[PDB]
Amino acid sequence: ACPAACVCSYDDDADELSVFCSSRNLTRLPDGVPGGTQALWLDGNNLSSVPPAAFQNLSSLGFLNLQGGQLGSLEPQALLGLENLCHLHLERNQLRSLALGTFAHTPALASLGLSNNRLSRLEDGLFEGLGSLWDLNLGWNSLAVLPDAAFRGLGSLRELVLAGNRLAYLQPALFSGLAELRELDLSRNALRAIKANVFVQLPRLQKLYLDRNLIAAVAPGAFLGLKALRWLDLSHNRVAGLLEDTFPGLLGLRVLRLSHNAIASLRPRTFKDLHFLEELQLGHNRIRQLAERSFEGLGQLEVLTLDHNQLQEVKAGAFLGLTNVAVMNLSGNCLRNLPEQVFRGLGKLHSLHLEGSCLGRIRPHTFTGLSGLRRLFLKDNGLVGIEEQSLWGLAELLELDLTSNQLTHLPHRLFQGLGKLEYLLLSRNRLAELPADALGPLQRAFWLDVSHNRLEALPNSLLAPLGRLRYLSLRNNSLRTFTPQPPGLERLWLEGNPWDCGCPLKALRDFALQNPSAVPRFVQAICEGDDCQPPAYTYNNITCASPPEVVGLDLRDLSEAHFAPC
Amino acid sequence: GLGPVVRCEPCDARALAQCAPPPAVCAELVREPGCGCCLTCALSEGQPCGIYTERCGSGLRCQPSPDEARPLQALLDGRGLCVNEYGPCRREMEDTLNHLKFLNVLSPRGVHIPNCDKKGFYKKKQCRPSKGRKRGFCWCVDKYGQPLPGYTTKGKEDVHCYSMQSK
Amino acid sequence: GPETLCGAELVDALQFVCGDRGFYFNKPTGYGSSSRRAPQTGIVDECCFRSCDLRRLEMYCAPLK
Ligand SMILES: *[C@@H]1O[C@H](CO)[C@@H](O[C@@H]2O[C@H](CO)[C@@H](O[C@@H]3O[C@H](CO)[C@@H](O)[C@H](O)[C@@H]3O)[C@H](O)[C@H]2NC(C)=O)[C@H](O)[C@H]1NC(C)=O
Ligand SMILES: *[C@@H]1O[C@H](CO)[C@@H](O)[C@H](O)[C@H]1NC(C)=O
Ligand SMILES: *[C@@H]1O[C@H](CO)[C@@H](O)[C@H](O)[C@H]1NC(C)=O
Ligand SMILES: *[C@@H]1O[C@H](CO)[C@@H](O)[C@H](O)[C@H]1NC(C)=O
Ligand SMILES: *[C@@H]1O[C@H](CO)[C@@H](O)[C@H](O)[C@H]1NC(C)=O
């Protein structure tokens, strides 16, 4: 007894009669449908305004999916007879308005969706007789002002979404009687100037989003009663100044975000009573200098990221109360004349970026109290010299990085303490010759990299106390001869130098012929499938120049008989 | 309260053009598992099965061993039989899947959830969704989520993030 | 005791089990009576932090037409 137009399903584990009238070109509803249905799908069709008497004789329901389509009118008495309905969906129709009474026939509702419709001017008392609703979605509409007591009668509500709308004002009586709300969302609206008595009787809130609005003031006293709360968000706004009594009592808080604002200075004793934070973010603001004891009380932080302010000087004793801090970004602000002994106390760090700053030099007491580090970055400052006793304190260290500076030579007692290095990167400098013995202490090293310098010779006694290499690069360096000292290599790049193809250059030929996967010819660049069409190739060609009888030719293929007086 | 639905992309002559198509001679030519359109020959009854091998013959099922105490790993490594207090990672997963809930339909190559253990810390190594007998790119990271240098020797989309070796 | 699976292996396993039908992140609300009342968090949290197996995976496939 199915209308022979829809896929009729049957009992699976109960008496469900799921009727599938979804993807089909339909005009107004079919008839002769089953009476004992338990779920009905109707999305995708081209219906219009429903008749008042449409859904009677279906005293068992609980699913009325109606997304898509071209619906715009709900004539009165439309939902008459549905006493056991439990879900409803009207997502992407083009509705325009709802009169009073349309929800008087359907108590025991448990979710509602009116998301991408087109409607404004809610009435005063629609959602009444709905003391069991749990969800409510109203985002992406044209709402601009709400009367008082619009949410009247919604006792047991737990979620609420107002996003993409155009609200501009919040009177102090909107959220009244919502004693079990749990998540609020007010993003992407046009609010300004949070007042001081709105959020006072929501004693169970847990999330709060105020992401992208135009906010320029926050009265002192707001956020007063919110005992339980764990996620604030005020990222993209225009907050111009924090007072001392702006966060007075939010004990349980755990995540603040204040990026991309326009804060211009900090005060003596902000940020107190926040014994339980674990992440701060003060990103692209305009903070100018740090006074003594500005961060105080945040004795349990983990991440700071002051990464693009115009910070020009830091006094000794700024980072004071930060005990358990592990990561600090700091990279991008022109810290030219930093003092010394400024990082004392922080003996629990693990990673410190310092790139992008305009440092200049390194003095004997720059990094002193950091006997816990594991990763330094120092990429693009512009150093012209590092002193001899600068790194005698960092016992644990696994990666240096000095990529694009302008050093010209290294002191011969520099790596005395670093007995645990594993990555050494010294590209793109102006070095002229590497020291004679200053590579002894490195015993756990692999992955050396000295490309793009202007070296001129490598003696054999230089790479002997390194029995762990697996990677080596020498591109574009102006060398003439080389013999592979580490036998268990797995990579070699050698393109760009003026090699001399004579007798002493033969072990390289043998090693390249017997180990063709360690010294390849070319490897195919990365590709992701859509851009795999072009086969980008990185090259590795060895040329002969100093002898004119083998000039131009490659080494792997020259004659097989030139090495006969050799 | 319903969210989007994920479903594989309908392939066309483009796929068969990119996918080398030389089906060797055999009986009961079938399609390869997952959702990928490159025809191959089926397996017999009693040969190893898996997630990245071919699919069993007609009227057959690929079930793990009747013990092993670890089904999903045993099926990932190809050992089946054809038989008839936040952390650094939870804070990222949260606002990752808090964004995939306001959209309509999407494809299984647009999901980008990280891979981290049961204490909120990144695990060792990260990967990307596959497409049936063709895995995705992978790389190595550290505890807080910073990448490390590394190379490959077998080929692209392949790495062994050992204790510290990235061979 | 219980095993756990999280990352892209989860997506591959879900592709393998369901097939050409699809899947959701929450339950497909089959005869919703207490599906919303009793809150099932989702497949990601349950299989990344508590326990995971094949029956729970099968429970989330889209229904065939
Ligand atoms: C510490 O702070 C620095 C601040 O610069 C962070 O570096 C920045 O990381 C972002 C990641 O989103 C980079 O943005 C990217 O830019 C490229 C274009 O250049 C764009 O194609 C990408 O879509 C993305 O927007 C940003 O450029 C980069 N800044 C630098 C140095 O270039 C760094 O990640 C932070 N590290 C942490 C938090 O540990
Ligand atoms: C619906 O109509 C379109 C054209 O109007 C047609 O292409 C399509 O096949 C129809 N749907 C079905 C299920 O036949
Ligand atoms: C329900 O039953 C009434 C009375 O028997 C019948 O006339 C009608 O067609 C049925 N359905 C509707 C549209 O209410
Ligand atoms: C080789 O090194 C020199 C020295 O800095 C540099 O100017 C040149 O650009 C490098 N070659 C290439 C191809 O970049
Ligand atoms: C490098 O050698 C390959 C052959 O292996 C050749 O096709 C390519 O043009 C050469 N490139 C250079 C830098 O001459």
Short mmCIF file of C-alpha atoms in Angstrom, two decimals, chain A residues 341-514:
data_model
loop_
_atom_site.label_atom_id
_atom_site.label_comp_id
_atom_site.label_asym_id
_atom_site.label_seq_id
_atom_site.Cartn_x
_atom_site.Cartn_y
_atom_site.Cartn_z
CA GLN A 341 70.52 38.97 31.67
CA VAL A 342 66.93 39.62 30.44
CA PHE A 343 65.88 35.98 30.18
CA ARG A 344 66.70 34.98 33.66
CA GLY A 345 64.44 32.70 35.55
CA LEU A 346 62.78 31.04 32.60
CA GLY A 347 64.53 27.70 32.97
CA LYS A 348 61.65 25.63 31.61
CA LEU A 349 61.51 26.76 27.99
CA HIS A 350 61.77 24.42 25.05
CA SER A 351 61.48 26.59 21.94
CA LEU A 352 62.43 30.25 21.28
CA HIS A 353 61.91 31.97 17.89
CA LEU A 354 63.87 35.16 17.51
CA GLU A 355 63.74 35.70 13.71
CA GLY A 356 62.71 38.83 11.99
CA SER A 357 64.20 40.93 14.84
CA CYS A 358 67.06 43.35 14.03
CA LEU A 359 69.60 41.94 16.50
CA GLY A 360 73.09 42.75 15.19
CA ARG A 361 75.54 40.99 17.52
CA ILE A 362 75.73 38.40 20.30
CA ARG A 363 77.42 39.27 23.59
CA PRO A 364 78.79 36.92 26.27
CA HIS A 365 75.72 37.22 28.53
CA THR A 366 72.77 37.32 26.15
CA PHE A 367 71.25 33.86 26.75
CA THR A 368 72.11 33.02 30.35
CA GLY A 369 69.29 31.42 32.31
CA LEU A 370 68.07 29.12 29.51
CA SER A 371 69.50 25.80 30.64
CA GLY A 372 66.56 23.86 29.26
CA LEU A 373 66.35 24.88 25.63
CA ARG A 374 66.00 22.51 22.72
CA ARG A 375 65.46 24.64 19.57
CA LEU A 376 66.94 28.02 18.56
CA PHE A 377 65.92 29.84 15.39
CA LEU A 378 67.79 33.18 14.93
CA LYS A 379 67.24 32.98 11.18
CA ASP A 380 67.37 36.35 9.48
CA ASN A 381 68.70 38.98 11.88
CA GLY A 382 71.88 40.07 10.13
CA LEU A 383 74.61 39.18 12.60
CA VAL A 384 78.18 40.23 11.82
CA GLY A 385 79.81 38.30 14.64
CA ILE A 386 79.13 35.89 17.49
CA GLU A 387 81.50 35.90 20.43
CA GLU A 388 83.47 32.96 21.74
CA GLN A 389 81.75 32.33 25.09
CA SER A 390 78.14 32.72 23.97
CA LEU A 391 76.87 29.13 23.90
CA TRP A 392 78.71 27.47 26.78
CA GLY A 393 75.52 27.06 28.80
CA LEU A 394 73.00 25.23 26.61
CA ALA A 395 73.64 21.60 27.54
CA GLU A 396 70.57 20.23 25.77
CA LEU A 397 70.25 21.46 22.20
CA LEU A 398 69.13 19.69 19.05
CA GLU A 399 69.00 22.33 16.30
CA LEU A 400 70.82 25.52 15.42
CA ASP A 401 69.75 27.83 12.63
CA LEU A 402 71.88 30.66 11.22
CA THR A 403 70.65 30.65 7.66
CA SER A 404 70.78 34.12 6.10
CA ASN A 405 73.23 36.15 8.21
CA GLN A 406 76.62 37.56 7.16
CA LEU A 407 79.28 35.82 9.24
CA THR A 408 82.80 35.55 7.82
CA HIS A 409 84.56 33.16 10.22
CA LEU A 410 83.96 31.07 13.33
CA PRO A 411 86.02 31.08 16.54
CA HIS A 412 87.90 27.86 17.13
CA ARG A 413 86.37 27.11 20.55
CA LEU A 414 82.69 27.68 19.80
CA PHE A 415 81.05 24.24 20.07
CA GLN A 416 82.55 23.25 23.40
CA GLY A 417 79.38 22.37 25.30
CA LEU A 418 77.05 21.23 22.52
CA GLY A 419 77.58 17.50 22.76
CA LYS A 420 74.07 16.66 21.58
CA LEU A 421 73.56 18.44 18.26
CA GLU A 422 71.72 16.70 15.45
CA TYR A 423 71.08 19.43 12.84
CA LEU A 424 73.54 22.15 11.83
CA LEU A 425 72.46 24.66 9.18
CA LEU A 426 74.89 27.31 7.92
CA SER A 427 73.63 28.16 4.46
CA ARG A 428 73.95 31.43 2.55
CA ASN A 429 76.70 33.10 4.61
CA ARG A 430 80.02 34.56 3.44
CA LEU A 431 82.36 31.99 5.01
CA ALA A 432 85.73 31.52 3.34
CA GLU A 433 87.25 28.52 5.14
CA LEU A 434 86.11 26.24 7.93
CA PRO A 435 88.39 25.92 10.99
CA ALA A 436 90.97 23.17 11.21
CA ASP A 437 89.71 21.22 14.23
CA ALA A 438 86.55 22.84 15.66
CA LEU A 439 84.35 19.84 14.96
CA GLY A 440 85.54 17.39 17.64
CA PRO A 441 82.85 17.72 20.32
CA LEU A 442 80.03 16.98 17.84
CA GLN A 443 79.65 13.21 18.16
CA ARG A 444 75.91 12.69 17.51
CA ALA A 445 75.66 14.83 14.39
CA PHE A 446 74.15 14.17 11.00
CA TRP A 447 72.59 16.45 8.38
CA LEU A 448 75.28 19.05 7.78
CA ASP A 449 74.57 21.82 5.26
CA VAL A 450 77.09 24.38 3.96
CA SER A 451 75.66 25.28 0.56
CA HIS A 452 75.90 28.65 -1.19
CA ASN A 453 79.00 29.90 0.68
CA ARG A 454 82.38 30.53 -0.99
CA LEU A 455 84.56 27.80 0.52
CA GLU A 456 87.75 26.82 -1.24
CA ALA A 457 89.10 23.52 0.18
CA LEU A 458 88.22 20.69 2.56
CA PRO A 459 91.11 18.76 4.15
CA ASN A 460 90.79 15.05 4.83
CA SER A 461 91.43 15.47 8.57
CA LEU A 462 88.26 17.55 8.88
CA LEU A 463 85.47 14.96 8.58
CA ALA A 464 87.18 12.10 10.41
CA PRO A 465 85.63 12.51 13.94
CA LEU A 466 82.09 12.27 12.53
CA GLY A 467 80.94 8.67 12.29
CA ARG A 468 77.23 9.37 12.02
CA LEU A 469 76.70 11.48 8.89
CA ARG A 470 73.86 10.60 6.54
CA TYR A 471 73.41 13.84 4.57
CA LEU A 472 75.75 16.43 3.08
CA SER A 473 75.26 19.34 0.68
CA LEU A 474 77.89 21.43 -1.12
CA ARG A 475 76.06 23.18 -3.95
CA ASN A 476 77.62 26.25 -5.54
CA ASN A 477 80.79 26.62 -3.48
CA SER A 478 83.87 26.96 -5.75
CA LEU A 479 85.74 23.73 -4.91
CA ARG A 480 88.10 21.64 -7.02
CA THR A 481 88.65 18.19 -5.44
CA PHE A 482 86.96 15.98 -2.87
CA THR A 483 87.20 12.38 -1.61
CA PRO A 484 84.25 10.79 0.26
CA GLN A 485 85.38 10.48 3.90
CA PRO A 486 82.12 9.11 5.55
CA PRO A 487 81.60 5.74 3.76
CA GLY A 488 77.97 5.20 4.89
CA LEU A 489 76.56 8.31 3.26
CA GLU A 490 73.08 8.40 1.78
CA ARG A 491 72.96 11.76 -0.03
CA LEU A 492 75.37 14.00 -1.90
CA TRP A 493 74.69 17.16 -3.88
CA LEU A 494 77.62 18.46 -5.89
CA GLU A 495 76.30 20.76 -8.65
CA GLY A 496 77.93 24.15 -9.33
CA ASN A 497 81.64 23.81 -8.60
CA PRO A 498 84.48 23.80 -11.19
CA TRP A 499 85.71 20.22 -10.85
CA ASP A 500 89.11 19.12 -12.17
CA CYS A 501 88.73 15.77 -13.94
CA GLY A 502 92.20 14.33 -13.51
CA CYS A 503 93.86 11.44 -11.67
CA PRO A 504 93.11 12.41 -8.03
CA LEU A 505 89.40 12.64 -8.87
CA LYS A 506 88.67 8.94 -9.29
CA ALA A 507 87.33 7.67 -5.97
CA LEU A 508 84.38 9.98 -6.55
CA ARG A 509 83.77 8.27 -9.89
CA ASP A 510 83.86 4.82 -8.32
CA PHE A 511 81.57 5.81 -5.45
CA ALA A 512 79.10 7.41 -7.85
CA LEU A 513 79.06 4.38 -10.15
CA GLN A 514 78.71 1.73 -7.40
#
